[PDB]
Amino acid sequence: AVQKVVVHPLVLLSVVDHFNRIGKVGNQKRVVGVLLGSWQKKVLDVSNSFAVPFDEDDKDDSVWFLDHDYLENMYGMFKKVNARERIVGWYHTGPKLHKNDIAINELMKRYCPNSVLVIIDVKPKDLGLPTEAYISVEEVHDDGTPTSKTFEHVTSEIGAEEAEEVGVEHLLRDIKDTTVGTLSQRITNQVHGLKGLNSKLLDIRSYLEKVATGKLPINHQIIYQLQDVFNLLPDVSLQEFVKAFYLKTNDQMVVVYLASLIRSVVALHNLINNKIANRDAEKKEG
Amino acid sequence: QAAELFLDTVSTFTSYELMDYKTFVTYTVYVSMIALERPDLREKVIKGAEILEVLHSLPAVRQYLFSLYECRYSVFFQSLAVVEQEMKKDWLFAPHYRYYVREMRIHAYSQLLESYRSLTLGYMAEAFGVGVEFIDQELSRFIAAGRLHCKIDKVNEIVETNRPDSKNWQYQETIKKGDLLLNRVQKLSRVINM
Amino acid sequence: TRPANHRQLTFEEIAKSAKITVNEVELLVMKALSVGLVKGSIDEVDKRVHMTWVQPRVLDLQQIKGMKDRLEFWCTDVKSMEMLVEHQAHDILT
Amino acid sequence: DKKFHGILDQGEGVLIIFDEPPVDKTYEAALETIQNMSKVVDSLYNKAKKLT
Amino acid sequence: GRIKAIQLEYSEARRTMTNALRKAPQHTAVGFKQTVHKLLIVVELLLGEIPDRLQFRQPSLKRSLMPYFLLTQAVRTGNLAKFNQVLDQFGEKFQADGTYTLIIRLRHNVIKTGVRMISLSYSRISLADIAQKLQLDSPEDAEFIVAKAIRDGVIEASINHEKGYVQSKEMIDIYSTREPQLAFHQRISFCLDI
Amino acid sequence: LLKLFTTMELMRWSTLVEDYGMELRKGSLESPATDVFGSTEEGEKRWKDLKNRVVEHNIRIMAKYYTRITMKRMAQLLDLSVDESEAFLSNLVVNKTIFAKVDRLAGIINFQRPKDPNNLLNDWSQKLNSLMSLVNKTTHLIAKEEMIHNLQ
Amino acid sequence: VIDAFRLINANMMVLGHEPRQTTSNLGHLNKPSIQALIHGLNRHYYSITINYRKNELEQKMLLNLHKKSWMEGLTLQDYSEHCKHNESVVKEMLELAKNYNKAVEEEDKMTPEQLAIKNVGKQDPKRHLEEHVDVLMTSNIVQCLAAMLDTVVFK
């Protein structure tokens, strides 16, 4: 299907504004709308979004309303302002992927035959990216239920347009990884990556709590992947692998050695260049 | 450097003021073998038209060069002894006359040991000049020096070759070269700022 | 059954457990690999068969508890390596 | 003559063949760079020793 | 530097002096340069590292270091008789400079260096032959020092007590080991320091 | 023809001939068989060529599933004498078709390229990438099940 | 660059009485742009100060979202290609370093301003050499560090 879905900052912001605009109830309620955007070379881009009215009682989650006329009427407005953008999917806060959001996609399947739903939290206090993009994929089997239809995840990242980036960076003026070198990498990928790995691993452990207190009767497939995960663990570091590592870890140190030595020489010449400067100035002065 | 420069000027020698051509070829042949490797000789001093003709007038030097290539090691030393005594007397070469003889010997040993794997020093004691204790004594000093990759087993009187990869030497010297430069930069630092 | 560390099934150790002669186990391993059901290589010098990936199967309720152990022993290892960088790299952060 | 990469074993008349991988580079470049800067630091001495 | 030198704290003795050398005045203080140099070369010799040959040729060190240059000739060569024959010749000047105490303890090093090179160049050398090359004066005691040299890490390979030959292990492929990284850390740490 | 696709078909030329001797004499129509193989000279050449292809298939397939195969057992699978097996192997190796280095002093021939330091480590890099992706996929499948039906 | 505006009445200018009745030193903080002043700035319309409202929920959901990655931290970046990049960069320092020698002798001459202007057409090894060194040290420090970090996270 689609390899990845890029979400522009404007759409991200128009969803936070939507929740606060209607979230006067306070306790809890999702918010659902319709996404707009365009894609090229099998890579989706989402730029604009508008709010579609949507209500649903909590009990017996098979009741909900989405205004088709509002979707059709408003899209006539957005089409006039910008013709390039056409409906591509829908969004909803829905932190936990509520169950009823598998027949809703059928409602929006009319306007976009291959639509994607992006769940974007409005109240994020976490470390991961707050944009999960799912696509509908169909396959019926004899294990789950006679009617089988499940979402498949597509990697999503926050994009940036030339005009939006100007505003986005102006709006922050709060913190930036200035001098983006060894300092940002040691923190933007190494430490953060470990944090994510732990959380995902902890997520797996939480599900495995079913061993004692069964929640679902062994999903079967989840176990299959977990078995493959363990086999894929790098082979014990005791064989010829250890020699290969040293022959490469040390090989990288020579370049570091050479780079440092060149750095010292240039640093020493720089001090000489400056030191002779003030000595010459002082000598002439007195 | 001399071998590369001299070999280029072998065919163009207008500087008769010093080292008349007859001696210039000898110098080019005396430093050519200590400088370049065997494949380079094949098309620089052996097949070379200019140099082969001059040697016809010099019987001693010609047998010295072709001895190494022809692998007549017995005549090599007898030729390397005369070059030994001549280099001492000759100016501009006496300062490193000892270095030339020792370095040429190593260049000859490695040439013979490269082909085989487990040749016996009894076989070397005849095909590389007389003496079984001399080859034992001479070989031992050179292995300790770090060159002449080979390792001697006395009780069975056999020398087995080894194949050190071209990284141990490369690393061993990148640290020794680095140390020399590193010391120099250190001494500059103390020179400035008292 | 074998832990991933050893996985050095010898030719004899396979024939005995399947009732084959030693001079025939070779066609068995290839048959398994041809279908795509196990992955590995065959070394007919020391008479060994390497295995690297046996197709996953079902684990009722006890091998899954053991799977929990391997995640606890692994989450705690990754946890330690996180604070190690965070503590010795306090200056390089934020 | 650097055509093969093996040795002859006179014990049983066998011609062992070796791979002999390349020099790998990235060390001559480092080695020459060290020596090139070796004289660059030399050029720095006369800029300071005989100047300041 | 000298206080640690006499108390077997050699490792820091060399580093302390060399730091004093580079911080010592260059143009003047020539008198004490000889004394600092003399002790450092003796301290290095005990440690085992070969002192640089550059400072045995300086104009102001040629004469002074001659009694100590000849010493390094015997220490570098594994033979023990040369060291003894060098001590009796210049023992007085060692007395005069108040450093003879440190030299009489070099007899162990003259064997350690020789055993290192002898085990480096040979692979299976008869036990009796070891004594002749090291001038041990007897084969019975050769085993212990050869045996003792193994404990400290001077040489690696073991010995065959019954047969009577000292064997050496083929120590190759040093690059893969982690030692090169350790050597690079030392240079890297200081180079990033300056 | 299906014998060249599935099961990797370690073929025995003895079995191939005995199971398919019809393609040389007669069959349902055998019209191409008489022309393709039934001739005296032109057809006979195609008999040797087929054996070469059948031997080529055995050698190539054994390469995928073998790290080191003794020379003697190689002949049995290929159905040729040891000397002939070397001759065919050399022909393939010299033409840059199958990688194989043979140590005829011990009758062992290994089909493994001497692992390079970067290739050994590069594969380790790819193992992590799949492992990391699977972990991400594993968790994302858990939410579809654990966090969907539980709430119900 | 927004500079929201509003119109001034023509009656006031006819009356001549200055509008906006300034009662605080708040509006006279931004110097009007000369380009805008050429047109009807403070003559046919007056600018109004523009500021912005920002909250942590907005900021944290934009700043901590724009440039982020999920798992790129523990990726070893094509180990075969990494050393090839090093070889090309280092080889450039071999020639770059040599030109550094030739760029030190001719320096420290009279009229350094003449020397300063003399570096306006030819590459200066003083800066070029440093640029390569900077990338070389960070690439390997990160690349090497991920090697040991991975070796403990995974088995």
Residues E10 and E98 in one domain: yes
Closest CA to A83 of A118, A36, A117: A36
**How many domains does chain E contain in total?**
2
Same domain, yes or no: E95 and E176: no
Q: How far is residue E15's CA from residue F3's CA, in Å, rounded to a whole number? A: 76
Residue B117: which of B71, B148, B160 has the closest Cα?
B160
How far is G74 from A197, CA to CA, in rounded Å?
10
In chain A, residues 174-213 whose CB comes closer than 8 Å to chain C: 175, 182-183, 186-187, 190-191, 194-195, 197-198, 201-202, 204-205, 208, 211-212
d(CA A194, CA F8): 43
Strands A149-158 and A65-66: unpaired
Q: Does A248 touch chain E (CB under 8 A)?
A: no
SS3 call for C43: strand
- E48 min Cα distance to partner chain B (Å): 15
Looking at the structure, tell me whether residues E104 and E192 fall in a common domain. Answer: no
| Contact call for residues E78 and E133 (beta carbons, < 8 A) | yes
Kindly write down the DSSP assignment for every residue of D10-48, as one continuous string.
Answer: TTTTEEEE-------SSSHHHHHHHHHHHHHHHHHHHHH
Inter-residue contact C53 to A230 (CB < 8 Å) = no
Window C:29-48, CB contacts with F under 8 Å: 29-31, 33-35, 41-45
Decide if E137 is inside a domain. Answer: no
Query: What is the β-pairing status of strands E165-167 and E159-160?
Result: antiparallel
Rounded to whole angstroms, how far apart are CA atoms B31 and B25?
A: 10
Q: How far is CA F96 from the centre of its chain?
A: 16
Do A11 and A52 meet the contact criterion of CB atoms below 8 Å apart?
Answer: no
Of the partner residues C4, C65, C74, the one whose CB lies closest to the CB of residue A211: C65
CB A154 within 8 A of CB A160: no
Task: Give the mutation candidate from G63, G71, G148, G153 for the C interface (greatest C CB count, under 10 A).
Answer: G153
What contacts A209, CB < 8 A, 6 or more positions away? A215
Task: Return d(Cα B72, Cα B88) in angstroms, integer.
Answer: 25
With contact defined as beta carbons under 8 Å apart, do G135 and G89 qualify?
yes
Tell me how close the Cα of F122 comes to any Cα of chain A, in angstroms: 10
Helix pair E127-134, E107-121: axis angle to 10 deg: 130
Task: Indicate whether E106 and E191 sit together in one domain.
Answer: no
Q: Measured between CB atoms, does E22 come within 8 Å of chain A?
A: no
E78, E97, E127 - which closes a domain: E127
Contact A116, A134 (CB under 8 A): yes
Report how far residue B150's alpha carbon sits from residue B140's, in angstroms, rounded to the nearest whole number: 10
Shortest distance between the Cα of C46 and any Cα of chain F, in A, equals 9
Is the distance from CB of E118 to CB of E125 less than 8 angstroms? yes
Considering CB atoms only, which of D12, D14, D19 is closest to F114?
A: D19
- Tokens 């870890």 label which residue? A249
The set of chains that have 3 or more CB pairs under 8 A with A is B, C, D, E, F, G
Number of residues in chain F: 152
Tell me which of E127, E150, E176 is where a domain ends: E127
User: E23 with E86, same domain?
Assistant: yes
CA distance B44 to B33: 11
> Helices A221-231 and C63-88: crossing angle, nearest 10°?
50
What's the Cα-to-Cα distance from E1 to each of C64, E16, E26, E49, E97, rounded to whole Å? 66, 6, 19, 17, 16
Task: Identify the DSSP state of F68.
Answer: E
> Are E176 and A268 an interchain contact pair (Cβ–Cβ within 8 Å)?
no
H/E stretch holding E125 reads strand E122-126
Query: Which of G:25-44 have CB within 8 Å of F?
Result: none
Nearest to B26 by CA among B78, B75, B63: B63
Full strand arrangement of the beta sheet holding F101-103: C48-54, C38-44, F66-70, F108-110, F101-103
* Inter-residue contact E64 to E34 (CB < 8 Å): yes
SS3 C48: strand
The answer as to whether E1 is a domain residue is yes
Pick the residue from chain C with its C-alpha nearest to F108.
Answer: C45
Q: Is residue E61 part of a domain?
A: yes
Q: Work out the minimum CA distance from A11 to partner chain E, whole angstroms.
A: 47
Using CB atoms, which chains have 3+ pairs under 8 A with G?
A, C, D, F
Measure CA of the first residue to CA of the last residue in chain E; give whole Å: 24
Phi first, then psi, for residue G62 (nearest 5°) are -120, -50
Residue E96: give the domain boundaries. Answer: 1-127
Q: The tokens 């009215």 sit on which residue?
A: A53
Closest CA to B110 of B152, B139, B70: B139
Say how many Å lie between the first and final Cα of chain F, rounded: 54
Contacts of C77 in chain G (CB under 8 A): 152-153
Which residues, listed in sequence order, are joined to residue B159 by a DSSP beta bridge? Answer: B152
Q: Which residues from chain G sit within 8 angstroms of residue A158, using beta carbons?
A: 65-68
Query: Between chains, do B187 and E172 touch, taking CB under 8 Å as contact?
Result: no
* DSSP code string of E57-78: SSTTTHHHHHHHHHHHHHHHSS
Return the closest-CA partner of residue A222 out of F143, F148, G70.
F143
Taking the C-alpha atoms of residue D42 and residue G143, their distance in angstroms, rounded to an integer, is: 34
Beta-carbon count within 10 A of A221 CB: 14
CA B25, B30, B35, B36 dihedral sign is: positive
Which residues have C-beta within 8 Å of that of residue A276, sequence separation ≥ 6? Answer: D47, D48, D51, D52, G108
Interface test with E, best of A256, A262, A269 (most E CBs within 10 A): A256
Chain G residues near residue C5 by CB distance under 8 angstroms? none
Q: How many other C-beta atoms can be found within 10 angstroms of the C-beta atom of residue F116?
A: 12
The two tokens of residue B175 are 């640290």
Of C71, C78, C82, nearest to A191 by CB-CB distance is C82
G5 strand-pairing partners: G47
Q: Are residues E10 and E93 in the same domain?
A: yes
Tell me the one-letter amino acid at B116.
Y
Q: Would an 8 Å CB–CB cutoff place G73 in contact with chain F? A: no
- The verdict on E106 and E194 lying in the same domain is no
Q: Which two tokens stand for residue G3?
A: 């500079």
Please name the helix (run of DSSP H) or strand (run of DSSP E) that holds residue F19, with its range, or none: helix F13-19
Experimental determination technique: cryo-EM
Do A234 and F123 contact (CB within 8 A), yes or no? no
Q: How many CB atoms lie within 10 A of CB D29?
A: 21
User: Which chains have at least 3 CB atom pairs separated by less than 8 Å from chain D?
Assistant: A, B, F, G
Distance of CA B1 to the CA centre of its chain: 14
The verdict on residue E186 lying in a domain is: yes
- Using DSSP bridges, classify how beta strands A86-92 and A116-119 pair: parallel, antiparallel or unpaired: parallel
Task: Output the DSSP codes for chain A.
Answer: --SEEEE-HHHHHHHHHHHHHHGGG-S----EEEEEEEEETTEEEEEEEEEPPEE--SSSS---EE-HHHHHHHHHHHHHH-SS-EEEEEEE--TT--TTTTTHHHHHTTT-SS-EEEE--SS--SSS-S-EEEEEEE---SSS-SS-EEEEEEEEEE---HHHHHHHHHHH-S----S-SHHHHIIIIIIHHHHHHHHHHHHHHHHGGGGTS-SSS--SHHHHHHHHHHHTSPPPTTSHHHHHHHHHHHHHHHHHHHHHHHHHHHHHHHHHHHHHHHHHHHHHH-
Query: How far is Cα D44 from Cα D50, in angstroms, rounded to an integer?
Result: 10
The answer to the question of residue E67 being in a domain is yes
CA distance A160 to A189: 20
Burial call B67-101: b when 16+ CB within 10 Å, e when fewer: bbeeeebeebbebbeebeeebeeeeebeeebeebb
Buried b (16+ CB within 10 A) or exposed e, G75-109: bbeebeebbebbbebbbebbebbbbbbebbeeeee
Q: Is G154 helix (H, G, I), strand (E, B) or coil?
A: coil
Burial class (CB in 10 A: 0-12, 13-18, 19+), E21: middle
Q: Do E120 and E177 reside in the same domain of the chain?
A: no
Nearest CA in chain G to A269: G104
Lookup result for tokens 């040691």: A186
Q: How distant is the alpha carbon of residue B68 from its chain centre?
A: 11
Query: Which of B153, B165, B173, B191 to probe by mutation at the E interface, max E CB count within 10 Å?
Result: B153
Question: Residue E111 corresponds to which tokens in the numbers above?
Answer: 């064997």
Which of G101, B135, F51, A119 minimizes the C-alpha distance to D40? G101
Query: Is E93 within the bounds of a domain?
Result: yes
E174 and E102: one domain? no
CB contacts, 8 Å: A195 with chain C: 82
Touching subunits for chain F (3+ Cβ pairs under 8 A): A, C, D, G
State the helix-helix crossing angle for B97-115 and B21-35, rounded to 10 degrees: 50
* E25 and E117 housed in the same domain: yes
Q: For residue D42, which of E188, E55, G130, B183 has the smallest C-alpha distance? A: B183
Bridging pattern class, strands A86-92 and A32-40: antiparallel
Whether B18 has its CB under 8 Å from any CB of chain E: the answer is no
Q: Calculate the alpha carbon distances from F102 to C47, F59, F68 in Å.
A: 18, 14, 9
Q: Please tell me whether residue E84 adopts helix, strand or coil conformation.
A: helix
Please tell me whether residues E117 and E177 are part of one structural domain. no
Are residues A223 and C89, on separate chains, in Cβ contact within 8 Å?
A: no
Instruction: Write phi, then psi, for E93 (nearest 5 degrees).
Output: -60, -30
CB of F114 less than 8 A from some CB of D: yes
Which helix or strand (DSSP H or E) is residue F102 part of?
Answer: strand F101-103
- Other residues' Cβ atoms within 10 Å of the Cβ of residue C66: 10
Distance of alpha carbon E165 from alpha carbon E171, whole angstroms: 19
Q: Which of D26, D36, D40 sits opposite G83 (nearest CB)?
A: D26
Other C-beta atoms closer than 10 Å to the C-beta of A77 total: 9
The secondary structure of residue E124, as a DSSP letter, is E
Residue the block writes with tokens 């390997």 = G140
* Cβ-nearest to F122 among G75, G80, G150: G80
> Is residue E175 domain-resident?
yes
Q: Which of G104, G128, G133 to mutate to test the interface with D (most CBs of D within 10 A)?
A: G104
Separation in Å, CA of C27 to nearest CA in chain A: 25
Phi-psi region of G77 (alpha: psi -120 to 50; beta: other; left: phi over 0): left
Looking at the structure, tell me whether residues E103 and E38 fall in a common domain. Answer: yes
Nearest CA in chain E to A247: E176
State the SS3 of chain B: CHHHHHHHHCCCCCCCCCCCHHHHHHHHHHHHHHHCCHHHHHHHHHCCHHHHHHHCCCHHHHHHHHHHHHCCHHHHHHHHHHHHHHHHHCCCCHHHHHHHHHHHHHHHHHHHHHHECCCCHHHHHHHCCCCHHHHHHHHHHHHHCCCCCCEEECCCCEEECCCCCCCHHHHHHHHHHHHHHHHHHHHHHHHCCC
In terms of Cα–Cα distance, which of A168, A190, A45 is closest to G63? A168
Helix axes A240-285, G125-153, angle to 10 degrees: 150
In angstroms, rounded to a whole number, what is the distance separating the alpha carbons of residues C39 and A232?
Answer: 13
E117 occurs within a structural domain = yes
How buried is residue C29: exposed, middle or buried, by Cβ count under 10 Å (0-12/13-18/19+)? buried
